[PDB]
Amino acid sequence: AQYEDGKQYTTLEKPVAGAPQVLEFFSFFCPHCYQFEEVLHISDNVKKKLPEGVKMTKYHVNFMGGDLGKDLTQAWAVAMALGVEDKVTVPLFEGVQKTQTIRSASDIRDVFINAGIKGEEYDAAWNSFVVKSLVAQQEKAAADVQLRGVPAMFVNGKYQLNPQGMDTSNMDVFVQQYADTVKYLSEK
What we know:
five-stranded mixed sheet
C-alpha cells in the first residue's frame, strides 16, 4: 500500500475501548515534544486536517522529570480545567527546557500567574478534586496504552503514529505527512 502498518503507524495488539478519538501524550521534559510544539506545531496542523466531529485530546505524563514531572501533570490538569492550555504551554516548555527557571511547583505556579490566572484561582484549582480526576484520567489513558515514550499519538485506541518511518529532511513535509497519516487512520 502507501500506508502500511509498521511504517507510518503501528497497531496496538490490545486495542483500547472508549478511547479518545485523537489522543496525544507529551512531557514538558521531552525534547522532541518541545520541537513538536514550538517548531512543528503538530497538534495544530493535525486539528486542521481532522474531519468534522473529531475531538482532540492532549495529556501530560509522569515518567519524566521525577517529582517535578508529576507536578507538571497536575498543573496540566489545572490548565485543562481552567481552559488556559494555550497560554501556558509555551512558557512551561521554555521554563523547563530553554531558560531552566522551573525547578519547583512554585515556579510552575509563577508561569500561570504571569499568564494572568489569579493565585487564588490557580491554588483553588490545584487543590480541587475535579483536578484530581483530571490527573487520574491522564494517568489512566497512559496506562491503557503501554505508554513509555513521548511524544506519542493514538487514534481511536487502535493505531499509534510512528514518526520514525517518515522523512525529516523537510520539516514542513514531515508535518503534512504526519497529519495526513492521522487523517487516514481517523477514517479507517
